[PDB]
Design a protein around this nucleic acid. Sequence first.
RNA 1: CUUUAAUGUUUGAUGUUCUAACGUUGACCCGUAAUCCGGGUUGCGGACAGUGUCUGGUGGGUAGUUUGACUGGGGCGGUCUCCUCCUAAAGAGUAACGGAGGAGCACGAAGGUUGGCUAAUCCUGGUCGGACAUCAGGAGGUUAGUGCAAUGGCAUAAGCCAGCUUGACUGCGAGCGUGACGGCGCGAGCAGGUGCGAAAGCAGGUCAUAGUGAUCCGGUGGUUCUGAAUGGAAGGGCCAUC
RNA 2: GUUUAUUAAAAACACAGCACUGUGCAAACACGAAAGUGGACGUAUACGGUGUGACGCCUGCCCGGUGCCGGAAGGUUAAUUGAUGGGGUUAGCGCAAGCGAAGCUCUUGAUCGAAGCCCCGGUAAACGGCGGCCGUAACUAUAACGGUCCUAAGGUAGCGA
RNA 3: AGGACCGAACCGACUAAUGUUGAAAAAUUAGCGGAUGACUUGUGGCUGGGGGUGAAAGGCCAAUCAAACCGGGAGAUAGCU
RNA 4: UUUUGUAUAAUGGGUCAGCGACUUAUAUUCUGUAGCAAGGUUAACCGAAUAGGGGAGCCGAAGGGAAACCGAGUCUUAACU
Lengths: 64, 50, 96, 79
Amino acid sequence: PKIKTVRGAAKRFKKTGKGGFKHKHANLRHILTKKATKRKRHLRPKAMVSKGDLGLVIACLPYA
Amino acid sequence: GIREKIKLVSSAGTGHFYTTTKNKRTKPEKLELKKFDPVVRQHVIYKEAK
Amino acid sequence: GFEGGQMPLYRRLPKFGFTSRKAAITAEIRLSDLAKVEGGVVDLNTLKAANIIGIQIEFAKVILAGEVTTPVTVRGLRVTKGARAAIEAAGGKIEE
Amino acid sequence: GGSTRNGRDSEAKRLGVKRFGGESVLAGSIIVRQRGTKFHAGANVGCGRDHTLFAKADGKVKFEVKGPKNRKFISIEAE
RNA sequence: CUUUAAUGUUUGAUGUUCUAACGUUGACCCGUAAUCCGGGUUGCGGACAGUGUCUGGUGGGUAGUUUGACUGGGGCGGUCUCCUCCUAAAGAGUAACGGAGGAGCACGAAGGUUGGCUAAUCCUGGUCGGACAUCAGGAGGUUAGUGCAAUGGCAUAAGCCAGCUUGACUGCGAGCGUGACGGCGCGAGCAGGUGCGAAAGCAGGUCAUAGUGAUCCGGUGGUUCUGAAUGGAAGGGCCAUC
RNA sequence: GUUUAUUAAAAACACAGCACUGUGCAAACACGAAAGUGGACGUAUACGGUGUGACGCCUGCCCGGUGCCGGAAGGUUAAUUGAUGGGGUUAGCGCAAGCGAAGCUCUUGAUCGAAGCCCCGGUAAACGGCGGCCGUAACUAUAACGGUCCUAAGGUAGCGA
RNA sequence: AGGACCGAACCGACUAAUGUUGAAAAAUUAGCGGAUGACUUGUGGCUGGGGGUGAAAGGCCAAUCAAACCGGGAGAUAGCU
RNA sequence: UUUUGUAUAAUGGGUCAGCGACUUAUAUUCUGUAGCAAGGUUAACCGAAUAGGGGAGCCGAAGGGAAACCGAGUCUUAACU
């Protein structure tokens, strides 16, 4: 034991060329008829984490 | 499933389709709707609905 | 892994898990560096003798970082747009 | 014949008065269920499905102190 | 080929007949004047016993575990998500078992558009006619009608008549908006092809606000992505979706 | 007879009497991984167990529900057998789509499947249940009796502050 | 012929008082039950912790028991003192 | 000492002298402080003992994308916008 990478975070985040972390959207593959196509198109580009969760993700991925 | 969902397909020989949900417990009826095809670049009647 | 309730964000997102797997086994060489090959010759069938970027390597690539000043000669490999143009600016040759 | 329940928050905010404004759209007051009780009288065209006192134009508000009936129009001040 | 009279060889089951497996839950003899064991000798049973099993079911005698919350202690009654008014203090912000009433849908049409129409209801008279529901006349009505609570809009009709119709579009969006964030609202302007209208202009769903639930799990489809010695495939990803 | 040592000797437990139920000789039933023991040097005039309580007069009706028991056909179904279809590969007829076989191979699982359970009956000295209204006798009061309603069926005997 | 009636030794420990940081780590005083028997007592053995013993009370099993005693696990654990 | 609140009749406390609780290591951020710098720095083992050898090791220096792949550029795309 020597401090571990949380693999449930590693398979969910990639690191950007500015320190921030980039991820996918939820509620998008099991129900698809319940969003209008404007909302559908705006959920085809991905998202980045905000400071309210970055301050924990950066500790669950210390070697990232 | 058993409630079903519609997968209405292009009549222009294209693989293009649209999806929608429609209750059958009120009445059972097939949808005949006109929609855009981005591959032949026109709006046409779509087929193979529920 | 706890914020009092409502789960951490790392347990409320989709997994994808797909990666290169080639990146950790690629020797990425810079023009600002290359002192392990001394401005001589580079070929992947003899790169193990120089051990640049490691010994468990399967791929080699040169990138545009810095400036090269001596006529280094490349045999195969991968060279980028600006890296080829910087090697030719030093009198160096790329044989394909 | 019942007890409790009273709704969540109504989600409205009034501020499109006096000389309030915007820099691409004059979004005005967030209002409910009234499509044109104030309504636009100049280039401040809008007030759509969300009933909000929103205009498809930029500037600060003006009040004319007359209306179509009854009521009182809303407009925008000089650029 | 088939019906019908038969039939070899194995393998289950069932019945019968043996004795070489096994017992003896019979005895004597010997080891050995040892009530055990083993051998031997002679009888008696018998392919069953007697012993040991795993599969699956039954399985609570045994074991571990689980146990919603709110709140003048608590169950019962009300309630937890989502919606409208008053509470809400003539800013933003805002509560309980405060005072009240609703929703977990329905419509390809009840959607888009151009023109036309505009109510409801009471009262007097009116025909089989049945106060009244055929009908007209007088008054009266943005409190009729709409899908549904409530509130308020609605003729620049979103209400109902006629015709034409699918923009309930594929790809993007300056800039602004609700919230702690997740979830999310409005929108100048463009691309690809159109619909209504004489035309300006109108259309990126319904009158606006309620109409099931993340990660996770499996499945269906397209793929000059990947598939760890060279490949395919299975698995994974991208892009679609139940 | 037995009993809570220093809170409590009984109205509790039990035999006798009676029902219920397991047991046929290598008994059932029981222990112990087992060898070895008990039941038993017992054989049903014997053995292991549940309730009620000698003795006398007695032992109500209801099997619809849960449990138990007898019956037997058929259903459902796990094991196992391996039909049908699909996936990876692929022969072969059609322009191509459409399809699509034997082998290797991934997957499915038609079908065979005791008894219970379902069914029918039995069992209340098993677990339990033992209901409405209307009229009926000339004060008043209450029904020895019909009618209709519920159902599995609606307290016989004896006792009663 | 006594699981006879009464009653000493012998056994019990029901009733009242005393003692209650006692003389006694429940003893004394006077009654009371049983007393040839489902009675009692000396000696050596056998039954042990979810195991004994119990004609059964959460009664009894070494001044310890709704699971006794002793060596280790052990510094069990705790939106907690 | 509890408790918002105690001269409190709320908690304890005899005598006197002793014993008796927050210790330091690694990792890292801010704060403080020096050296070096587009370069700075090895473990074990050897060993003139921490030097000198040992670069397996450790930081910085490029980004776009799920990835193929590209790169001071790049994903999405019919795309100019």
